């Protein structure tokens, strides 16, 4: 049963990869969808056994590394944390593959697309089920490999090609730090196995623990697109929408969160790292929402929402509330995949295939089913009470105030603004696409029709999960005293109770008031008083609008300064070292020295009695001179060469 | 063979130059500044880090001999 959950998507990758030429376009897509579905049913069967019956599965294929004390096995273990992670991964992957059957039906290369999509699914299953960090790193790298091939899938497009490289290189920067953390783990503990390392967490030096997890923190930022290594995330929109619906929902963007939750037995014994995770998450929630309120591409707006929500998971980990982070991780994968799916529905429906909300407007009637999915998913994203996002996001924001520390209070306002900005950019996206006066040509609206049932079916399934799912699963992850020993919480760090009993009732509804009250005010201005949003008039507003629309000018600073100077250093080394001083102290320099010396010696070979007689008689001075003068004669001779 | 590559004169001139940058390199003040940084300054920086911590980091099975969490809480009011 465990081998079925892990390796069945890998067989689907092989079939559409090598046998796609032989089974054709139609059957290749569905056989890959068959392989993912087998993993879906296998995962659900294992979910009952693990979570509800406390049964662990472990399959040890064979040994990988056997160098003295360092022993690494090809083992996969499924426990509460691992099987919980498979629930968003495998379920959303299946509903994205089934979505891609009709979305990609016009693409000339569909066997390759479903091969990369299923290979990506297999890598993510490997990451969360490996019994040690090296097996996690194997999935960690091949997620980046598969993300590179998916983002650059349309490789004739120059933008998609450079975007796939950008995602690969930034993640490979995170991999270089993850390798160092694993090397330090072998140095301090002698092992990478979870069972060995996690037993020693209390007895290891704090500095050793801090070094390992700082390396893990840098790797986490690259994959989860936290501030500093978040530039590739919006470039990842160059891939097909099914890639976005998968990468940004239950996949690569959540890998960094998993790495930190897995390391909780170690991460709890280093407050300094947890403080950094808190602040880095808080900064990225604030910045993502502010950028998303003046963004105009529909997929970029949703992508920035993904970055904002992952930062909500980081602040939960920062206050050592790992259980809340895992629960919000599962719930977010449902209604964020829905938002990407329902965005791709609108883009396909409009016959011009625009992606700019400024070219949309008045779509609500013509595509009512697409509007309903976005509406419910946005309300779930906006943590509207009763919905799945409400049971996972409201508690995380309130936990910042429940910390009663300086950092917790600062990050509460950052989270509160991000919660308010979430409502703002959700209403703005809905107004421009659906409720605004039509900006598209009249010909677009007479042809604006809903897509087929294969596209619709996964959206309906995810729509229900975005309504009820959080309420059903809340007690497993958020219930007080619920045993989740994989996520270790130190007794000094338990704040779930003061979060639940000590907060004022004004703060219990403050995120709800600002989002609902602020959203209505924003909606009125568009419909009735749009003259306030002609920001090109005011020069200060134009500069403030331009700063956030250009994403805090980070991409410009990265390319123009860090990447330009990184390539220029190679040029300076190439010019002044390899082709420079190493040639002067090499072939070119010695050739000039040889030519100068050999030209002097060529003038001394000529048949002349007086010349050789003078040299013979001159040599007699070596007999006359005392031998201490030899080095002065040597210096004199070198002068004559010149 | 059948000359399957459409040879470009500007490509050939550019490629020939990139291979032959050594001919025009001058050991001027700009070249000397980069030579000092790459072959003297940076190696010295790594040179002093390597021997400063030569045998000064016994990090194998390093133990924790000091508490992490505070026992008592003192309010700020």
């Amino acid at each position: 049963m465990i081998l079925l959950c892990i390796f069945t998507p890998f067989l689907g990758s092989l079939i559409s990869g090598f046998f796609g030429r032989y089974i054709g376009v139609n059957s290749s897509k569905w056989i890959v969808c068959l392989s993912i579905f087998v993993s879906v049913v296998s995962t659900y069967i294992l979910f009952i056994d693990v979570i509800f019956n406390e049964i662990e599965y472990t399959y040890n294929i064979m040994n990988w590394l056997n160098v003295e004390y360092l022993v690494v096995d090809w083992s996969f273990t499924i426990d509460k944390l691992s099987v919980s992670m498979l629930v968003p991964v495998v379920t959303v992957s299946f509903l994205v593959h089934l979505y891609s059957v009709s979305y990609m039906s016009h693409d000339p290369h569909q066997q390759r697309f479903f091969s990369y999509l299923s290979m990506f699914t297999f890598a993510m299953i490997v990451l969360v089920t490996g019994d040690n960090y090296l097996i996690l790193f194997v999935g960690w790298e091949f997620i980046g490999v598969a993300s590179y091939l998916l983002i650059s899938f349309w490789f004739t497009r120059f933008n998609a090609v450079k975007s796939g490289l950008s995602a690969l290189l930034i993640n490979r920067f995170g991999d270089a730090l993850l390798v160092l953390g694993l090397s330090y783990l072998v140095l301090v503990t002698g092992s990478v196995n979870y069972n060995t390392v996690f037993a020693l967490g209390s007895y290891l030096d704090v500095n050793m623990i801090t070094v390992i997890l700082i390396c893990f923190l840098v790797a986490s930022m690259a994959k989860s697109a936290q501030l500093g290594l978040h530039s590739w995330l919006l470039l990842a929109m160059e891939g097909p929408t099914p890639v976005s619906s998968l990468l940004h929902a239950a996949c690569l963007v959540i890998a960094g969160v998993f790495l930190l939750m897995r390391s909780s037995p170690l991460l709890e014994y280093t407050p300094i790292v947890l403080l950094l995770i808190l602040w880095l998450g808080g900064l990225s929630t604030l910045i993502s929402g502010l950028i998303a309120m003046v963004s105009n591409d529909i997929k970029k707006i949703i992508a920035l929402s993904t970055m904002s929500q992952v930062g909500i998971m980081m602040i939960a980990i920062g206050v050592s509330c790992y259980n809340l982070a895992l629960f919000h991780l599962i719930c977010h994968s449902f209604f964020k995949a829905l938002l990407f799916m329902s965005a791709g529905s609108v883009i396909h429906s409009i016959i011009s295939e625009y992606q700019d909300i400024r070219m949309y407007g008045g779509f609500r009637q013509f595509i009512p089913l697409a509007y309903t999915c976005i509406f419910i998913a946005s309300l779930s994203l906006m943590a509207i009470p009763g919905l799945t996002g409400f049971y996972s996001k409201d508690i995380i924001i309130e936990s910042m105030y429940g910390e009663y520390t300086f950092s917790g209070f600062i990050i509460y306002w950052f989270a509160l603004i991000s919660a308010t900005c979430t409502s703002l950019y959700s209403i703005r996206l809905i107004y421009y696409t659906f409720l605004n006066n039509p900006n598209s040509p009249k010909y677009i609206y007479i042809n604006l029709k809903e897509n087929d049932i294969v596209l619709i079916t996964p959206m309906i399934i995810l729509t229900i999960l975005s309504i009820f799912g959080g309420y059903l699963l809340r007690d497993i992850y958020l219930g007080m005293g619920s045993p989740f020993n994989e996520l270790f919480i130190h007794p000094n760090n338990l704040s779930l109770i003061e979060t639940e009993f000590s907060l004022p009732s004004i703060l219990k509804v403050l995120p709800l008031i600002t989002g609902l009250g602020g959203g209505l005010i924003l909606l009125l201005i568009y419909e009735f008083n749009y003259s306030l949003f002609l920001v090109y008039n005011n020069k200060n507003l134009s500069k403030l609008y331009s700063f956030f629309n250009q994403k805090i000018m980070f991409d410009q600073l990265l390319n123009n300064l860090i990447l330009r100077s990184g390539l220029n250093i190679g040029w300076l080394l190439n010019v002044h070292i390899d082709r420079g001083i190493l040639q002067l102290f090499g072939p070119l320099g010695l050739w000039k020295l040889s030519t100068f010396i050999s030209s002097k010696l060529n003038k001394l070979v000529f048949l002349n009695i007086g010349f050789i007689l003078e040299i013979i008689v001159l040599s007699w001075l070596l007999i006359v001179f005392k031998v201490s003068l030899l080095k002065y004669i040597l210096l004199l001779i070198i002068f004559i060469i010149l | 063979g059948p000359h399957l590559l459409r040879e470009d004169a500007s490509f050939q001139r550019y490629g020939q130059l990139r291979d032959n940058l050594a001919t025009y390199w001058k050991f001027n003040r700009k070249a000397a500044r980069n030579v000092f940084i790459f072959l003297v300054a940076v190696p010295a920086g790594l040179g002093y880090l390597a021997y400063n911590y030569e045998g000064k980091t016994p990090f194998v099975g390093k133990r924790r001999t000091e508490p992490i969490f505070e026992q008592d809480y003192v309010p700020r009011k």
Binding site: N560, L561, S565, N568, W571 | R13, L17, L21
Partner: peptide, 28 residues
């Protein structure tokens, strides 16, 4: 308006290799 990237020399001397103003082809 439009400006060249950093680390682009304003002059060079590589023998008889033609000397031309640097044009960032991304802006064409």
């Amino acid at each position: 308006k439009s400006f060249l990237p950093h680390f682009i020399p304003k002059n060079y001397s590589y023998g008889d290799y033609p000397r031309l103003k640097p044009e960032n082809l991304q802006k064409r």
